[PDB]
Amino acid sequence: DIVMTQSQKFMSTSVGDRVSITCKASQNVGTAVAWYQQKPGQSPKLLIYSASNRYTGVPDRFTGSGSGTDFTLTISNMQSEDLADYFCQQFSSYPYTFGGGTKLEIKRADAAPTVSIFPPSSEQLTSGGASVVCFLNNFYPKDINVKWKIDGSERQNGVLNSWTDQDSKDSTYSMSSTLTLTKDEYERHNSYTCEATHKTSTSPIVKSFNRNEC
């Protein structure tokens, strides 16, 4: 079966940029390639068919090119409505495989996260589970890494991270990072730390508390 590789899963762009989305077929597919865009909650919409033909109603900003194994969708003068997921698909032979997708997001000035740490609530500590929450809010770019420590020792198991979609007004991202452990383990340690690595600081932002302090 043919593999269609979109190596760039995420692209950050400014309005007005020339956006280049690449699709590489694992074998020669001629010109049998379509491009779609998809927005959340909707079915995909066809942009380009048979490599280089623009579908009716699609803005002339979109152009497909290429043949053989290498295909390109170019968006000239990118507009905010072009933020979407983009997929290629081949029709040379079954199965009619899709590329992995490229999600186009918008660039803005870098912004450091605002980080806040929350010990387990008294109500959760009746349960035998304990969650320590860090919110990392209103940052850009999306790339960020959170490292949790308990009494100096890194903890990787039990960490759950959730990200908001890029905000429609301020173009930032926010993230919750939640360390869940047993209540018994939580009460055997004092120091809890979440460390955020982000390009806006040469060293991570550190939020930490001592459980028994006020």
Partner: protein, 396 residues
Amino acid sequence: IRCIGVSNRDFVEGMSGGTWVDVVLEHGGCVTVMAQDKPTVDIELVTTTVSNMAEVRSYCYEASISDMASDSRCPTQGEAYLDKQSDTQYVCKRTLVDRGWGNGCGLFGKGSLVTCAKFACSKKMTGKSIQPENLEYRIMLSVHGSQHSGMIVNDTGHETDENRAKVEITPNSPRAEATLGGFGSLGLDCEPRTGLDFSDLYYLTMNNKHWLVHKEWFHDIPLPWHAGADTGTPHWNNKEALVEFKDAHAKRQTVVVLGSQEGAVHTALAGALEAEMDGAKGRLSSGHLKCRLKMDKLRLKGVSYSLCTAAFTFTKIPAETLHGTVTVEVQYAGTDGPCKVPAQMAVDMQTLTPVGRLITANPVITESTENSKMMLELDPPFGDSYIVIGVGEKKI
């Protein structure tokens, strides 16, 4: 052998025109050549193989429709063309339709619709061409004599064991000399390009079946037909007529699939031979050939023997065949070198006289095994008569 029960029988009396006897062969039947100069030789056609076929046109048994869309320009207006009219691969039909007033535009007069639908075939049927070149034949032939009647139908000794040679005949070689070891060799000349009447027959495949079709049938049929030369993606001709885009009388123009036709082509084909195939090649069965059989060198292997002693028994008892010949099995317990077996169809006994043709030629049991079998067959006269075997007081 390769004869008897076949029930479509042709006897050809010959040994005149220096074995110039000419014979026709039909996959149904077989002709036996009886010539005093020869042991009686049984010819039968088996399978006519065709190989190195090429594809010509093709069709769509089962249509499938995908995306129906339409637009209309109101009142007189070059039917607004959808984008779908530029890709081919889409049926489109431009019709006239009333759009009155609240249809959105003045002059609720007659406007125009253009409806289009993607058209993608399902399954297919692909004709194939058969050319007289790369045409083969297979003729198996055998010689009565007396081999074991249980061997009447077998294909293990196709290349060995008494009379039984498999002859190929293909264009670039009308002739093959079949060497039946010890009987000499039967000169055989056949016209491959003439008989079967090819070049008028396209070889045709529905799903997992086969046929033959006279041209001016398969060339003219009303279905979508791929151009046949390129398998990359179908770019159809036709593409209507398996899809009926029809309308009522309001604002709509609908479109229908037609639910394949695969039942039609079958019920359409009549008087078309069935056919089967193994891969790149395929095996018809309907025989026709004109073979001029050269009987020149045939050496009876049953001459210059004694007469097998007395000790003949019937096994399975005699029987009648079809056109009236009789077959006999005889097991000679006589322990002797390969020896000649006397047989005569006698009218009474007032004077043991030969009556009626004995056609096995000269039955000669070849074994040292002291118990052997020989199947000799003969056609006695119309009235009551005896079949007699042996010349000793132990004759049966």
